[PDB]
Amino acid sequence: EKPNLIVIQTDEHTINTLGCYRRLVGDINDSPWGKNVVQTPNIDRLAKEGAICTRYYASSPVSTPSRASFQTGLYPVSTGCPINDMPMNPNLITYAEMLKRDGYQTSYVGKWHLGGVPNIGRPYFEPGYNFGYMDRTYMFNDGHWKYFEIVKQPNKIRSYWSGPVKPGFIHVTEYLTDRCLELLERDKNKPFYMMLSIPDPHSPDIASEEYLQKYINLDYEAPETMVTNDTDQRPRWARNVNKDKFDKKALANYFAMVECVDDNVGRILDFLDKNNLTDNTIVVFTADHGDMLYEHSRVNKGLPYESSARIPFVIRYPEKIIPGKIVNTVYTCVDFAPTILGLMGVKQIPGLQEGINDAQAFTNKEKNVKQDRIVYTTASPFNDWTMATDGRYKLVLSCRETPWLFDLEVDPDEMKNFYNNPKYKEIADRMQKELIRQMKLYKEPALSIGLPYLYKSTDKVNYNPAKYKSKVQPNALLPMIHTIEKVCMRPLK
Amino acid sequence: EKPNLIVIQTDEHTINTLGCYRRLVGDINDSPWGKNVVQTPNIDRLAKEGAICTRYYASSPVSTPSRASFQTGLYPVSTGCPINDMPMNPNLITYAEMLKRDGYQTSYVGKWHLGGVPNIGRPYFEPGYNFGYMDRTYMFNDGHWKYFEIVKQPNKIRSYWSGPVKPGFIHVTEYLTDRCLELLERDKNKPFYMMLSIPDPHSPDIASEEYLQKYINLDYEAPETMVTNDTDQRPRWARVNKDKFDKKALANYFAMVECVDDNVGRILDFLDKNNLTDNTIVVFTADHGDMLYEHSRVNKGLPYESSARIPFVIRYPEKIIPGKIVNTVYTCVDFAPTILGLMGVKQIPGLQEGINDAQAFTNKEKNVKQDRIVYTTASPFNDWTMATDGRYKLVLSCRETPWLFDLEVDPDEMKNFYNNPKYKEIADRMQKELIRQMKLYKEPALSIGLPYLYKSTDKVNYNPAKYKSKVQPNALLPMIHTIEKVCMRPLK
Ligand SMILES: [Mg+2]
Ligand SMILES: [Mg+2]
Structure with a gap:
């Protein structure tokens, strides 16, 4: 059945x-x-x-x-x-x-x-x-x-x-x-x-x-x-x-x-x-x-x-x-x-x-x-951050900030960064290696775009979204396409 | 085979x-x-x-x-x-x-x-x-x-x-x-x-x-x-x-x-x-x-x-x-x-x-050669519609009164025969077919309510802007085009 x-x-x-x-x-x-x-x-x-x-x-x-x-x-x-x-x-x-x-x-x-x-x-x-x-x-x-x-x-x-x-x-x-x-x-x-x-x-x-x-x-x-x-x-x-x-x-x-x-x-x-x-x-x-x-x-x-x-x-x-x-x-x-x-x-x-x-x-x-697994998430408009989690540890990499590591067992409210704590060095390393590996495997757009991601806490932010944008000429036909969509394609009559 | x-x-x-x-x-x-x-x-x-x-x-x-x-x-x-x-x-x-x-x-x-x-x-x-x-x-x-x-x-x-x-x-x-x-x-x-x-x-x-x-x-x-x-x-x-x-x-x-x-x-x-x-x-x-x-x-x-x-x-x-x-x-x-x-x-x-x-x-x-009339439509603004039996071509529009073309007598299409009394019946039968086919094939001009002139005595009163829509621009298009070039259709 x-x-x-x-x-x-x-x-x-x-x-x-x-x-x-x-x-x-x-x-x-x-x-x-x-x-x-x-x-x-x-x-x-x-x-x-x-x-x-x-x-x-x-x-x-x-x-x-x-x-x-x-x-x-x-x-x-x-x-x-x-x-x-x-x-x-x-x-x-x-x-x-x-x-x-x-x-x-x-x-x-x-x-x-x-x-x-x-x-x-x-x-x-x-x-x-x-x-x-x-x-x-x-x-x-x-x-x-x-x-x-x-x-x-x-x-x-x-x-x-x-x-x-x-x-x-x-x-x-x-x-x-x-x-x-x-x-x-x-x-x-x-x-x-x-x-x-x-x-x-x-x-x-x-x-x-x-x-x-x-x-x-x-x-x-x-x-x-x-x-x-x-x-x-x-x-x-x-x-905000x-x-x-x-x-x-x-x-x-x-x-x-x-x-x-x-x-x-x-x-x-x-x-x-x-x-x-x-x-x-x-x-x-x-x-x-x-x-x-x-x-x-x-x-x-x-x-x-x-x-x-x-x-x-x-x-x-x-x-x-x-x-x-x-x-x-x-x-x-x-x-x-x-x-x-x-x-x-x-x-x-x-x-x-x-x-x-x-x-x-x-x-x-x-x-x-529970199975031991890490997964990755991606940012939509500007691909400005990437994230990997194993269930307790969440690592965020970005072109807008230095790396952030979250511990949901100790800090469920995600208010603190543990990336620079030497006690979390092995965790951070494991999570960063996996995020980079998954970013490459799943064709993370940020890597293709060449976004300035910070993989080290010593790094500085140098990011203007305007440099990775492609300005576009406006279609003159769209005012008429909108009319035909309303009256012809999807008619209320 | x-x-x-x-x-x-x-x-x-x-x-x-x-x-x-x-x-x-x-x-x-x-x-x-x-x-x-x-x-x-x-x-x-x-x-x-x-x-x-x-x-x-x-x-x-x-x-x-x-x-x-x-x-x-x-x-x-x-x-x-x-x-x-x-x-x-x-x-x-x-x-x-x-x-x-x-x-x-x-x-x-x-x-x-x-x-x-x-x-x-x-x-x-x-x-x-x-x-x-x-x-x-x-x-x-x-x-x-x-x-x-x-x-x-x-x-x-x-x-x-x-x-x-x-x-x-x-x-x-x-x-x-x-x-x-x-x-x-x-x-x-x-x-x-x-x-x-x-x-x-x-x-x-x-x-x-x-x-x-x-x-x-x-x-x-x-x-x-x-x-x-x-x-x-x-x-x-x-x-x-x-x-x-x-x-x-x-x-x-x-x-x-x-x-x-x-x-x-x-x-x-x-x-x-x-x-x-x-x-x-x-x-x-x-x-x-x-x-x-x-x-x-x-x-x-x-x-x-x-x-x-x-x-x-x-x-x-x-x-x-x-x-x-x-x-x-x-x-x-x-x-x-x-x-x-x-x-x-x-x-x-x-x-x-x-x-x-x-x-x-x-x-x-x-x-x-078989008897048939077909119709053509205008793309950007649906401002004209046309029907042809092969010799007579009728054009209806919101920018002009009706035009009838005789390709036997005028192959260079320079003259209008719609208001010629010898072509009154051909014009009438051509117009009827154009309007019938326009309704059957869902001609957009009828749905847009464009001001088409169906008589030689009609006057053109058409503003295209009255039928056009307001289009807000999309903020995301700049980033979509980058993704298309570098991710969807890469040169590398
Ligand atoms: Mg949304
Ligand atoms: Mg063309």
């Missing part, structure tokens, strides 16, 4: 907003922002009835590069899309194409960000190459709107970022979930692969008023990693919101968005239970990247810090995954395709897979799983 | 630079520019040994839209790329994909213009989706550079617009022809489909000195269709005066065509030596033509015959009788259905907005 696959992805979602991750490091009611943190009962069910990954990271803490690595089993340079808005190479084979080729009905509902399509001020559905997704009716490339209006039935939709909900407006999280439930009912009696990518926790921290009412008046605490000018000891790749400008209204909005998400994940899980698909359906809860959310005095920033770099990875496969399993092995989005295809018995993406198939970690009987 | 397919396509190539088309309308040594016109012996061989199409037009007289229509059997709006630099829909099936599905080894050497990839100052090889093409090593998206230099063997090339020529420099036409022949030798004993798209005629008009010396000092005459500021009676959609005629540019254009024709001979000589002529279909065509000083215009995509018409010569010795002339009107939308019908290959699944007229080439008629 071929297992079904449902992947639920969020955008800019910090693991600290999930109770499953907060309980792993302490009380579920303690958070960087205190006790009024959002509770995630429905997502936490997947952890309780399955496996939680404590060291899952984005290949790059930016949307397009991470999403690309999740589909391809490849680092962002080999996907064609290391920067946002770049098209993913249409010739590359995705895990969805492998599922399609094994007789699976494939559907994507939500934000793609891999099609390279223009912004038309409204959701751009069916964007770019299918990449193995048969139903892309409710797949749109990019947008931060919170409300949708349905002008024509298929997917002719007007989008709105803010404002009260007008009479025919639907909150996007509910809409996309409602659409996914419909496709799930149609394919419940066949091998099906559904991916719902919800964009809500993302940047425009604007939430539904029925969710905001529950958080706007509550009290929140500024994260203890927040800085003041005289207490700023952060690396320069992270030097000082403790004085911590915004509790934006925090309440983010918490309200996460509750809408968890409620809507529950409707998907309630459906599976009612239609008896829980046992033979693999459910994954994940995100493209996380959010600093005022931690380290940063917000919405692609950083090697845990809150931004780390992504939630919770998987429930009742048949082959024991409940309460914790996988501590370090992983990136490059590992998803080989691992998910191995777990489902499906053939691997042919040729180069720069990741590992660790389906054994979930299929074995060990309640706590 | 499955026939081979070789398609040779040029860029911005007027039919009047081909002697096959010049002899169908007058003397071969008679041109709008005089008797010093380029002679095209090798391309003329395909007309003599096969069929010539007297009324073949581009779907849109602009590169990306016409190229997309040729591959997909669809008008440019349905290809995803009605305008240049827009990418073709990667989900669409091409005739190459249908050939790949029937065992054909498929290859493209030259300019694609459908991948939507960025300009990197050098050729961008392997551009975007394969679209049924299995060898795209020498397929580059866009660029009209005259010389290539090979830094690293596969496809790592630096490009020159026109240099004093250094030792490593290879002229693009010869380079691309050299690579096609290398791929043709490797697949000669298997069913093969090769397309060679040469960008040469389309250009900043710069030819190799070996070919330019043959034309730079000769004498050329300004076309009689040229106008002065005081004798201009052209439609406003076409509004280079005489005296701004550039014979040096013309010489460069003719020298470019002679290099092309010589290089087509090498492909034809290869087929003859390897005995592949009889079971290989060879097609010579172009995306669109060039006004080349005719109607006092040079490179503008217009409904005039020099821009709108495309060369279409086809030789299949097994099924096509030598000397055939097909006068049925066609657009590039018709190629895929017809080529697949001719090769006995499954038609592209789903909607085809064109016809499979392989019977016209296979039949016993030396002069084929």
Whole structure:
């Protein structure tokens, strides 16, 4: 009996907003922002009835590069899309194409960000190459709107970022979930692969008023990693919101968005239970990247810090995954395709897979799983930092700062550098040798660009991003391309 | 046994630079520019040994839209790329994909213009989706550079617009022809489909000195269709005066065509030596033509015959009788259905907005003519639409009142017959068909709400800026271009 696959992805979602991750490091009611943190009962069910990954990271803490690595089993340079808005190479084979080729009905509902399509001020559905997704009716490339209006039935939709909900407006999280439930009912009696990518926790921290009412008046605490000018000891790749400008209204909005998400994940899980698909359906809860959310005095920033770099990875496969399993092995989005295809018995993406198939970690009987492994992450807009982690030690190399070594056992809040401590010399050496080796193997763009990285603490910063930029002539035809995309390619009539 | 397919396509190539088309309308040594016109012996061989199409037009007289229509059997709006630099829909099936599905080894050497990839100052090889093409090593998206230099063997090339020529420099036409022949030798004993798209005629008009010396000092005459500021009676959609005629540019254009024709001979000589002529279909065509000083215009995509018409010569010795002339009107939308019908290959699944007229080439008629009207569209601004039955050409526009052309009575297209009472019924039946086809093929002008004039009494009230969009610039493009040059398409 071929297992079904449902992947639920969020955008800019910090693991600290999930109770499953907060309980792993302490009380579920303690958070960087205190006790009024959002509770995630429905997502936490997947952890309780399955496996939680404590060291899952984005290949790059930016949307397009991470999403690309999740589909391809490849680092962002080999996907064609290391920067946002770049098209993913249409010739590359995705895990969805492998599922399609094994007789699976494939559907994507939500934000793609891999099609390279223009912004038309409204959701751009069916964007770019299918990449193995048969139903892309409710797949749109990019947008931060919170409300949708349905002008024509298929997917002719007007989008709105803010404002009260007008009479025919639907909150996007509910809409996309409602659409996914419909496709799930149609394919419940066949091998099906559904991916719902919800964009809500993302940047425009604007939430539904029925969710905001529950958080706007509550009290929140500024994260203890927040800085003041005289207490700023952060690396320069992270030097912004000082403790004085911590915004509790934006925090309440983010918490309200996460509750809408968890409620809507529950409707998907309630459906599976009612239609008896829980046992033979693999459910994954994940995100493209996380959010600093005022931690380290940063917000919405692609950083090697845990809150931004780390992504939630919770998987429930009742048949082959024991409940309460914790996988501590370090992983990136490059590992998803080989691992998910191995777990489902499906053939691997042919040729180069720069990741590992660790389906054994979930299929074995060990309640706590850890393998000795190092993984590397990359910076998206400017490739200005690189990072390697073994689970406890995190090494950051940059053209904007001298090397930084973090110890999560001794300093979980990543507030101190241990690179120059002679007691950590062997660790630093091992981590630096691996980062350089992985940088060369996975074609780190910084090496091709010749960025001035500092591999020694004696080095000085000499970096102007302008020298590595290629100024570009503006296309005079784009004003007319935008018109034909709106009125001809994606018409509201 | 499955026939081979070789398609040779040029860029911005007027039919009047081909002697096959010049002899169908007058003397071969008679041109709008005089008797010093380029002679095209090798391309003329395909007309003599096969069929010539007297009324073949581009779907849109602009590169990306016409190229997309040729591959997909669809008008440019349905290809995803009605305008240049827009990418073709990667989900669409091409005739190459249908050939790949029937065992054909498929290859493209030259300019694609459908991948939507960025300009990197050098050729961008392997551009975007394969679209049924299995060898795209020498397929580059866009660029009209005259010389290539090979830094690293596969496809790592630096490009020159026109240099004093250094030792490593290879002229693009010869380079691309050299690579096609290398791929043709490797697949000669298997069913093969090769397309060679040469960008040469389309250009900043710069030819190799070996070919330019043959034309730079000769004498050329300004076309009689040229106008002065005081004798201009052209439609406003076409509004280079005489005296701004550039014979040096013309010489460069003719020298470019002679290099092309010589290089087509090498492909034809290869087929003859390897005995592949009889079971290989060879097609010579172009995306669109060039006004080349005719109607006092040079490179503008217009409904005039020099821009709108495309060369279409086809030789299949097994099924096509030598000397055939097909006068049925066609657009590039018709190629895929017809080529697949001719090769006995499954038609592209789903909607085809064109016809499979392989019977016209296979039949016993030396002069084929069936009643049909076809339509062409304007690429950048959808400002004009055209319909033709072969003799009468109707142009509708937002910049001018309706224009009816009679190519029997006025082959130089200088007069309007729409408001001639003898042509009232023909104009009415032509306009009805244009509007019917415009609605059927989703003409963008109707969707944009452009102010098209459907009566001679109408007045032009059109502001293009009212229909154009506001475009914010992308901050990331500077860094994306660096990644493309150093990571995606490196010279090292
Ligand atoms: Mg982002
Ligand atoms: Mg052009």
